[PDB]
């Protein structure tokens, strides 16, 4: 949750009217930043639209991602050939309870992790030739490794601490889920029980099934987001027909004062 | 590499017939990033559909949420149509109110 991660993507052959390079920035589990090459400006997202911000903050984010935009596209000249290629970046840092930062700098090519940035040496590296070629092409650009290290060791912890002291409400946002427990016929003399949680934040949430109060399983479940950054979940369980009402669903979430028991609909 | 998308369809809030809501199609776990997603009302494409930023998880696979405002109904039939290079034919997942 005390993490700031940039998800960067460059594609060598973007469909017409789609960006060759785009970035989403994340404070824990919610997105705070948006950038693509077609528009060329970093924007706040979600709650951060209303975060009280210092002047030139998003200009600075835009400046840094623009540099990374040219570099990601340069990496395709280094590989040569036709591709097509997808280059992904996982850059950022994470605060610990000691107010110290741990950085992250990983890269993936065509869906496979192939290269990272070493912050003790200030170089990019990886096991295979494609890593070394991209590494060498970026080393060539003047001060590319310098800006790379600065982004990770100074800018990221700084941006993260700024959002902690002025967007503290957004991260500590606690939205309890709305719960439903419905049953439907599934098989000769069998039903499926689905316990669903709606529009909750943070995403940490546990669903379990009780039969007459006794434990009865987790069910097979699925998490997913909503358009506003909140989350959805549901687990299902196969029960005897006519026995459905003897079950209930118990949900644990930081937005609830205590575990909530949910019983079958009417 | 290639990864086949995973498709989840659900509403933002508990479904109540006659009451406005939001229908979500969450497409995840796919590679490469080119994907095509339609939300359907009784088999016809809904025109006013939005989506989130194309993002990706820690295993580098991409995910994407499509969503539209709608009003559920006992009769109306909603589905999500997804096409991806890993699919021989478009994959249509019906919205089940239970989830």
């Amino acid at each position: 949750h005390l993490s700031l991660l940039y998800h960067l993507t460059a594609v060598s052959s973007p469909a017409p009217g789609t960006p060759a390079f785009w970035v989403s920035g994340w404070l824990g589990p919610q997105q705070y930043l948006s950038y693509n090459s077609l528009r060329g400006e970093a924007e706040p997202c979600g709650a951060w639209v209303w975060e009280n911000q210092v002047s030139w903050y998003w200009e600075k984010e835009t400046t840094d991602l623009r540099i990374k935009e040219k570099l990601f596209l340069e990496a395709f000249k280094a590989l040569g050939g036709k591709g097509p290629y997808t280059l992904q970046g996982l850059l950022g840092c994470e605060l610990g309870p000691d107010n110290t930062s741990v950085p992250t700098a990983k890269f993936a090519l065509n869906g496979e992790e192939f290269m990272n940035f070493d912050l003790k040496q200030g170089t990019w590296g990886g096991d295979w030739p494609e890593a070394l070629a991209i590494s060498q092409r970026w080393q060539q650009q003047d001060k590319a490794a310098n800006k790379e290290l600065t982004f990770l060791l100074f800018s990221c912890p700084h941006r993260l601490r700024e959002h902690l002291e002025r967007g503290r409400g957004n991260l500590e946002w606690k939205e309890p889920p709305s719960m439903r427990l419905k049953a439907r016929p599934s098989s000769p003399g069998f039903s499926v029980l689905t316990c669903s949680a709606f529009s909750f934040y943070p995403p940490e949430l546990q669903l379990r099934f009780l039969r007459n109060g006794l434990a009865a399983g987790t069910g097979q479940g699925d998490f997913g987001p909503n358009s506003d950054g909140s989350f959805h979940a549901s687990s299902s369980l196969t029960v005897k027909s006519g026995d459905e009402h003897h079950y209930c669903c118990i949900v644990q979430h930081a937005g609830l004062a205590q575990p909530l028991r949910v019983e079958l609909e009417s | 590499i290639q990864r086949t998308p995973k498709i989840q369809v659900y509403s933002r809030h508990p479904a109540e017939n006659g009451k406005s809501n939001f229908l979500n199609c969450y497409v995840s776990g796919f590679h490469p990033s080119d994907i095509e997603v339609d939300l359907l009302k009784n088999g016809e494409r809904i025109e006013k559909v939005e989506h989130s930023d194309l993002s990706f998880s820690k295993d580098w696979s991409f995910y994407l949420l499509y969503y539209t405002e709608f009003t559920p109904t006992e009769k109306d039939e909603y589905a999500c149509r997804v096409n991806h290079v890993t699919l021989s034919q478009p994959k249509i997942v019906k919205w089940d109110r239970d989830m």
Partner: antibody
Amino acid sequence: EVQLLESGGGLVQPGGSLRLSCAASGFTFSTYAMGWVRQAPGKGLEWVSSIGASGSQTRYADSVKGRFTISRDNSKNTLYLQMNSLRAEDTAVYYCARLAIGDSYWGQGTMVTVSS
Amino acid sequence: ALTQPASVSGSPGQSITISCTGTGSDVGSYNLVSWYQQHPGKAPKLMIYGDSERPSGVSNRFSGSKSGNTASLTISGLQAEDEADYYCSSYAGSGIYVFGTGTKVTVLG
């Protein structure tokens, strides 16, 4: 200045084992993936195996899967190739190779003969 | 799975072409074609990489190209010392290579 020297070539009975070596010099060894490419007498090049720059990932052709084990010692600047369960058709010159996108450096080769 | 004609021949100063078949990549994957020249009793020499790029100190007369399942090496201004074995090579990434069948070039006259 870049130099690669294969060692360990010789004659082996079928079913036996043999460890080839390659002494690298003239570059930062730990930066580069390394590989082995073999050539049977009067025949084409056959890529055998590759190993990541740090040794954490290895690759093998179908023809040698499970019998050969490429490995690496970066402190000693040396590439290894442990061949077990040798079959007659493994007879070849075995080339040490530095892997790169835009350049290719090889050794002189070392002769491996598999014969009763 | 790379396939080459067994031999090609030409006259001094002309251009010849050696074809490579099997250089196709799946969707979401890629490959890079290299061309190697091998003179008798010698290690191969890299002549073309990245489908069409020449290393430092390789003659202008060598050029390469890829197109779908076929890559081709073209030797122009054919000289006698161009007589050798030529192999196409495909790097698919993650350390996996495949070598072509090989083509012996002879220079007529």
